[PDB]
Ligand binder design. Structure first.
Ligand SMILES: Cc1cc(C)n2nc(N)cc2n1
Length: 829
């Protein structure tokens, strides 16, 4: 059809990639995936509750934290209900459903409807106690009144979905390599290495002879491997590398139809910038003009009681008790395999056990599939996200192993899917095939919930915009989502994309070059910028017109744009603007990953009734070194606070921060609340930041709200474990080497928080490992990743762990202003 063609054009603009362009493909896997994702999409669309989909209530099944219960007076929650120019306050029980609150309202005022949060597209609806609504918890946490408007539920009609319509050994011939132009810092020798890989592990390796490195190098050589065709596992990669490591490319040996790869291939390779998720890609380099190519030929197809003694059991249990980074010896693997039926009784053993499998032996793989048919213990075990994420990393390439991990994820509630969404999207990179149980899981959860769907859009779009390695795969997943989200959502994304593309242009234009910014913005406000758009990092908020007068270019070397928008919602309780920073020059994908880990740390702390006052601000990467950042209101840099008393060239003063806090507090009651908030937030950031190895920061990269909330920024790319400078210590009523009630509180909070994180050691290790592999380029799959195991002091008891962190606090006190001064000393010399 022609409107079908028009609809595909609309999808192309939203995706930022054309899924129908078949220039960079050697098989129909992507097209097969597009067709394959139709069924799971249609099944999810057919399954959703129209009213609940339209209203997307944001709820949790978790208990109300102890720190939140203390904020409730006499089992009473006040809700302010608006109707027009008037309002009405109503007392409610924490266990009261919005349905019962609505009936309580009509009774109180006598002589169909829905409760919507004033100024937001957020609804307090469904069979849930009000204490379980995220907005209510947000209000309770932040000391804000719950303001609601009585309005008509959104028409589910707006979400209408458009109607759709061999015992021989394996061998490979390396013909040669070709590159148009040589200048590559040298003039050398080259050889080709061919690896058969499964789960990051090399099953077999062959190499060509070394030859002089010219624009064309030929071998015409058969490289015969020790592995039999019969023994090649599904998901095995033929990894081809050029050593001078300079270039790499992968080819799936068994395709998406279970057929062995045959014939001629000319593969355009990826160059090493000068392990990680990019090294695993089955995509070929789309740049056919300047990339190195490798020419190969394949010529080769259906797919083919006892009890442990005491001491061996103790040995096995000790292997299983070790962290995810502890290497498995040949003996350890053999024990795990030999007593696999005992290992299966321990869910925590699963990653180690499946790493003990000889994936290059058909009979062994067969035995593994037999083993997993008896999955009663795994199925009945409680969901452990950390343990599940370990099965979805680079170490596992078997579909059945990965699928049992995804099976476990099905039990996650929406609030929990949101917590892990970004790293689950990134984990798609470790899938051998485009169509996977993980990709289908993301698709389903996105289509089931608007909030998840909104973030799925942006997380996928971020990678499609700048990852040549994964854009094709991520584009097919995004298209599948967009074909089921409904027309209202399609319209919404269109507006957001239009706004971001225009603002990105202004960002780069101003970067090349205040008066000029304001002229460019009036021009946008004139004939381009749509009336309103959902804020990508906070979809409940709708931004209206730019407040031109409040817009500016930040006085930084990156010169980011500081933009302010009016809120488009008339029901908003304030005339306060929505602030967004647009910046080029930092890889904001790195900030996104750190910020998500901080949200996870907060949820861990919540389990132990701790509120560390982190501020994981909104951040979305929109393209190569470009994106948006949420502006936290009434916040300043620690360095700026120092500088306002006159920055003599790093002449730091101890009392300045406390002075600033006192100056910004309207009363002494508010000032004490600010000092309390600083103690908690300082503690939160010292712990979080130390664990992640990002603690040693310049003061210009730490901010504070007038309300005392400290927060670190700019995560994208002598020594100190974290920042606890003499100014921070003075706010805590401490100086030099003495102590105080606030500093004792700080130490107590840090220890409790650090110990709480250590209870989730394995989860933090997997999340850290995945973050490095997918977000921060070439990493030593050992050394770099091992930092977090050292930071989390694995193998220490709580008292030793407590002493360790208290000693880290002392290192900071010993160094004082020395490390902060070193940036200034360096920047001059
Ligand atoms: C990177 C960054 C993050 C936040 C939250 N803010 N807030 C302001 N006011 C500036 C800023 N920069």
């Amino acid at each position: 059809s022609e409107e079908s063609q028009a609809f595909q054009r609309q999808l192309t603009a939203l995706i930022g990639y054309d899924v129908t362009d078949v220039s960079n493909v050697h098989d129909d896997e992507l097209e097969f995936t597009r067709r394959g994702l139709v069924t799971p999409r249609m099944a999810e669309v057919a399954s959703r509750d129209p009213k609940l989909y339209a209203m997307h209530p944001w709820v949790t099944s978790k208990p109300l934290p102890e720190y939140l219960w203390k904020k409730i007076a006499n089992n009473c929650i006040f809700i302010v209900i608006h109707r027009s120019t008037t309002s009405q306050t109503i007392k409610v029980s924490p266990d009261d459903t919005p349905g019962a609150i609505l009936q309580s309202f009509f009774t109180k005022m006598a002589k169909d409807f829905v409760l919507r949060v004033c100024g937001r597209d957020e609804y307090l609806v469904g069979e849930t106690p009000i204490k379980n609504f995220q907005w209510v918890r947000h209000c309770l946490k932040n000391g804000e009144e719950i303001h609601v408007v009585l309005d008509t539920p959104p028409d589910p009609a707006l979400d209408e979905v458009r109607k759709e319509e061999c015992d021989r050994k394996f061998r490979v011939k390396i013909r040669g390599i070709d590159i148009p132009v040589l200048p590559r810092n040298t003039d050398l020798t080259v050889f080709v290495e061919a690896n058969i890989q499964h789960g990051q592990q090399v099953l077999c390796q062959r190499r060509t002879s070394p030859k002089p490195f010219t624009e064309e190098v030929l071998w015409n050589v058969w490289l015969e491997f020790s592995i039999k065709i019969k023994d090649l596992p599904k998901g095995a990669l033929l990894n081809l590398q050029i050593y001078c490591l300079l270039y790499y490319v992968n080819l799936l040996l068994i395709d998406h139809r279970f057929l062995l790869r045959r014939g001629e291939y000319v593969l355009h390779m990826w160059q090493i910038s000068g392990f990680n998720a990019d090294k695993l890609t089955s995509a070929t380099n789309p740049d056919k003009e300047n990339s190195m190519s490798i020419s190969i030929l394949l010529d080769n197809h259906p797919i083919a009681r006892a009890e442990m003694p005491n001491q061996l059991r103790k040995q096995l249990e000790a292997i299983i008790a070790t962290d995810p980074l502890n290497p498995l010896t040949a003996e350890d693997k053999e024990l795990l395999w030999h007593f696999r039926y005992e290992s299966l009784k321990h869910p925590k053993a699963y990653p180690k056990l499946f790493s003990s499998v000889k994936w290059g032996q058909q009979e062994i793989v067969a035995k593994t599939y037999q083993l997993l048919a008896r999955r009663e213990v795994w199925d009945q075990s409680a969901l452990d996200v950390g343990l599940t994420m370990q099965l979805l990393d680079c170490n596992f390439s078997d579909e059945n192993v990965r699928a049992i991990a995804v099976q476990k994820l099905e039990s996650l509630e929406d609030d929990d899917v949101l917590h892990y969404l970004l790293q689950l999207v990134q984990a798609v990179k470790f899938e051998p095939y485009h169509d996977s149980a993980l990709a289908r899981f993301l698709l389903k959860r996105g289509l089931r919930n608007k909030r998840i769907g909104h973030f799925l859009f942006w997380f996928l779009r971020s990678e499609i915009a700048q990852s040549r390695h994964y854009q094709q795969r991520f584009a097919v997943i995004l298209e599948a989502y967009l074909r089921g989200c409904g027309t209202a959502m399609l319209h919404d994304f269109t507006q957001q994309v239009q706004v971001i593309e225009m603002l990105q242009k202004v960002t780069l234009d101003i970067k090349s070059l205040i008066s000029q910014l304001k002229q460019k913005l009036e021009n946008l406000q004139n004939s381009q910028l749509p009336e309103s758009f959902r804020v990508p990092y906070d979809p409940g908020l709708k931004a209206g017109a730019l407040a031109i007068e409040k817009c500016k270019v930040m006085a930084s070397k990156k010169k980011p744009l500081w933009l302010e928008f009016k809120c488009a919602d008339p029901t908003a309780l304030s005339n306060e603007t929505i602030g967004i920073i647009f910046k080029h020059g930092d890889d904001l994908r790195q900030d996104m990953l750190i910020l998500q880990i901080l949200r996870i740390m907060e949820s861990i702390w919540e389990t132990e009734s701790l509120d560390l006052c982190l501020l994981p601000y909104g951040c979305i990467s929109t393209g190569d070194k470009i994106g948006m950042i949420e502006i936290v209101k009434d916040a300043t840099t620690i360095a700026k606070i120092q500088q306002s008393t006159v920055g003599n060239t790093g002449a730091f003063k101890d009392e300045v921060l406390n002075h600033w806090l006192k100056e910004k507090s309207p009363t002494e009651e508010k000032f004490q609340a600010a000092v309390e908030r600083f103690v908690y937030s300082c503690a939160g950031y010292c712990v979080a930041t130390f664990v992640l190895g990002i603690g040693d920061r310049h003061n210009d990269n730490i901010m504070i709200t007038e309300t005392g909330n400290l927060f670190h920024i700019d995560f994208g790319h002598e020594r100190v474990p974290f920042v606890l400078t003499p100014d921070f210590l003075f706010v805590m009523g401490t100086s030099g080497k003495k102590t105080s009630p606030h500093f004792q509180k700080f130490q107590d909070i840090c220890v409790k928080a650090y110990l709480a994180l250590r209870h989730h050691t394995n989860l933090l290790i997997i999340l850290f490992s995945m973050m490095l592999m997918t977000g921060m380029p070439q990493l030593t799959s050992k050394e770099d990743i091992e930092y977090i195991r050292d930071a989390l002091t694995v193998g220490k008891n709580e008292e030793d762990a407590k002493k360790y962190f208290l000693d880290q606090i002392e290192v900071c006190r010993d160094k004082g202003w020395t490390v902060q001064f070193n940036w200034f000393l360096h920047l001059v010399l």
